[PDB]
């Protein structure tokens, strides 16, 4: 199995989607919070089925996104429904590598926060490959920008580099947000084309969702 | 989580740590005190854990002053600390007010000292119950008791320890009111033998004491000859 880990908005789910739509097996997707069930012994049933209709279907892939919501450090001093979370985690831990042979299936996983997973879930025989996902640095930013601005009529004053040069630690999802917001205000003003001033204003607006305590921590 | 400190009441109005400490006092062997016309008599069953100990190991009767005695049951470390505190109270009283401490006042001071250990989280209740008994021409014979909760109550006969109920059912028959220490001694050995369980525990050697008109008001270990005769009479009574 391969576990995709990295900072939020960096291309995990997208790469899984791609290797899904490009390959020739039955690719199945699940959200971790969708395994948190409100009747006892339903989460384990769900995981057992999910791995049951994957050998019925020839080569198969499973991608359990946002696994962090289900696999956590496994602190024992906890009460409530967390015990059920741990019990479903044990069921998964057995399915991946346990008594029987897993047949022909692969397991991909994603987690924005990975330091908090359980050692037995991401151990070598369960997940051999582990992939870090860094942010775009300087040029992948140019690539993504030209990817999302691809389908829109832009004015001939678009200083894209001027938007990219800033070391604002922008993320891929942030780039998509900037593209969409700029396009939307261009629609608002009726203007048949999108202008650089619109893109910079949109950049300022999107980054406006950062907050935090400035001097603190630095 | 309502039983982790003595600074918390149970939802039904109880301080559990004190209840547990008082439970501990029912794992130690049995002690007895009987008040009579002449004076007081303490008798304790001392279990011999191993054959390798000396005679008189961990004596469970102490002398807190020249006229006062002290029987204990439970944790021995707590018993010895409380013996130290009672000695200190007696010495301070003599130095301040110029005469031997009346026993009631000593019981009160010691009990307050114990009770102060059953209010705070920073300390834990003493695991020992004990009985003080003295005799004077004026105040006569007295016998008191103080439990881990710090309650002091006078007694005509009491048994603190494991087999406290059996002895209590036994001590009730003496009519101690109208005898003297000399016969109370034989009675005390008799009871301490009646209550002893030979199936569970292996063997014991008695510790006996008294304070009464026969000592001029001095608490002191009962002499060897009288102790042996008492033991022999108790043995015969256990046909």
């Amino acid at each position: 199995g391969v576990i995709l880990y990295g900072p939020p908005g960096t291309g995990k789910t997208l790469l899984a989607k791609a290797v899904a739509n490009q390959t020739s097996a039955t690719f199945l997707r699940v959200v971790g919070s969708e395994l948190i069930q409100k009747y006892l012994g339903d989460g384990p049933k769900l995981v057992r089925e999910l791995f049951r209709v994957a050998e019925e279907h020839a080569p198969s892939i499973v991608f359990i996104d946002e696994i962090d919501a289900i696999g956590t450090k496994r602190y024992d001093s906890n009460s409530g429904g967390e015990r059920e979370i741990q019990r479903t985690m044990l069921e998964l831990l057995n399915q991946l590598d346990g008594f029987d042979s897993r047949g022909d299936v692969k397991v991909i996983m994603a987690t924005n926060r990975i330091e908090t997973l359980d050692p037995a879930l991401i151990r070598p025989g369960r997940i051999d490959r582990k992939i870090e996902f860094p942010l775009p640095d300087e040029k992948t930013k140019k690539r993504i920008f030209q990817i999302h601005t691809s389908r829109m009529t832009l004015a001939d004053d678009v200083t894209l580099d001027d938007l990219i040069m800033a070391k604002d630690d922008l993320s891929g999802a942030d780039i998509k947000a900037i593209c969409t917001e700029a396009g939307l205000m261009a629609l608002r003003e009726r203007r048949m084309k999108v202008t650089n001033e619109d893109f910079k204003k949109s950049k300022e607006n999107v980054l406006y969702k950062k907050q935090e305590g400035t001097p603190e921590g630095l | 989580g309502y039983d982790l400190s003595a600074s918390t009441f149970s939802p039904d109005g109880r301080v559990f740590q004190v209840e547990y400490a008082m439970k501990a006092v029912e794992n130690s062997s049995t002690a007895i005190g009987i008040r009579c016309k002449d004076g007081v008599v303490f008798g304790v069953e001392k279990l011999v854990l191993s054959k390798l100990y000396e005679e008189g190991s961990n004596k469970r009767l102490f002398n807190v002053d020249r006229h006062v005695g002290m029987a204990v049951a439970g944790l021995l470390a707590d018993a010895r600390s409380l013996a130290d505190i009672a000695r200190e109270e007696a010495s301070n009283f003599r130095s301040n007010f110029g005469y031997n401490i009346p026993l009631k006042h000593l019981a009160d001071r010691v009990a307050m000292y114990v009770h102060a250990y059953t209010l705070y989280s920073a300390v834990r209740p003493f695991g020992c119950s004990f009985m003080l008994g003295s005799y004077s021409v004026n105040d006569g014979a007295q016998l008191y008791m103080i439990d881990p909760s710090g309650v002091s109550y006078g007694y005509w006969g009491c048994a603190i320890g494991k087999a406290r109920q059996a002895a209590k059912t036994e001590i009730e028959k003496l009519q101690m009111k109208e005898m003297t220490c000399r016969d109370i001694v034989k009675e005390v050995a008799k009871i301490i033998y009646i209550v002893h369980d030979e199936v569970k525990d292996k063997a014991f050697e008695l510790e006996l004491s008294w304070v009464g008109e026969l000592t001029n008001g001095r608490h002191e270990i009962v002499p060897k000859d009288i102790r042996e005769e008492a033991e022999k009479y108790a043995k015969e009574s256990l046909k």
């Binding site: 406006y208 305590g213 001097p215 603190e216 921590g217 | 982790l4 400190s5």
Partner: protein, 247 residues
């Protein structure tokens, strides 16, 4: 007892003091505060939250505080922690004055208070002070000044700032419409009235839901004043008239 301890002075697993973060989170709900340093004055513009018809008028102000003859400060956060910090600031000023017979410079003072606050968030087991300060003053070293403090103990000189509710918006306009070094006291007051009118989205400046302060040098000595009702309302009328002519 370790069972009930809160550990208000221990690092989190990413090196961030949580009690401090929450303290700064409390400030973002109290009244807004504004700083504007002119070339001939300094001015504090906070919002009067105690807006009820049954409150009484007392004292020369309600949020502005004097600290020396030549220094004043306004508060955002808890009122009681505010009082405690104000008292300690007054004491610091007088202790410096007693030792040196000179008025305490402004960064002398602000760093003394912030040192108390930082120490308080370093060891002791207490909760930190949930207050953020704005100060104003003059001293022969740097002239008119405008500082700011936070629950952490960090301060900063600001040509224009905003600490409290809607801080992001206020600092956004303050960035858009500040002439560095090209501001008279009158222009700064007008800019304050405008920015606050934005921020106090609830109604418009009622001339009574606001507090303004001015620190100036007059006749060689500092003079501190809190704007009365008539002048404030006149300023607001001028502001509305200017905006109307503009449209």
């Amino acid at each position: 007892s370790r069972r009930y301890d809160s550990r208000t002075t221990i690092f989190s697993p990413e090196g961030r003091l949580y009690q401090v973060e929450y303290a700064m989170e409390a400030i973002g709900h109290a009244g807004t505060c504004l700083g504007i340093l002119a070339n001939d004055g300094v001015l504090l513009a906070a919002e009067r939250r105690n807006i009820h018809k049954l409150l009484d008028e007392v004292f020369f102000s309600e949020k502005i505080y004097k600290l020396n003859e030549d220094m004043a400060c306004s508060v955002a956060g808890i009122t009681s922690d505010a009082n405690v910090l104000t008292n300690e600031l007054r004491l610091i000023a007088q202790r410096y004055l007693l030792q040196y017979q000179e008025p305490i410079p402004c960064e002398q003072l602000v760093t003394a208070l912030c040192d108390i606050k930082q120490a308080y968030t370093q060891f002791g087991g207490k909760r930190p002070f949930g207050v953020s300060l704005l100060y104003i003053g003059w001293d022969k070293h740097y002239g008119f000044q405008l500082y700011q403090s936070d629950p952490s103990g960090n301060y900063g000189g600001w040509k224009a700032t905003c600490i409290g509710n809607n801080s992001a918006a206020a600092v956004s306009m303050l960035k858009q419409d500040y002439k560095e070094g090209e501001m008279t006291l009158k222009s700064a007051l007008a800019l304050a009235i405008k920015v606050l009118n934005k921020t106090m989205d609830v109604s418009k400046l009622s001339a009574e839901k606001v507090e303004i302060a001015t620190l100036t040098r007059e006749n060689g000595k500092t003079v501190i004043r809190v704007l009365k009702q008539k002048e404030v309302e006149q300023l607001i009328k001028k502001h509305e008239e200017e905006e109307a002519k503009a449209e």
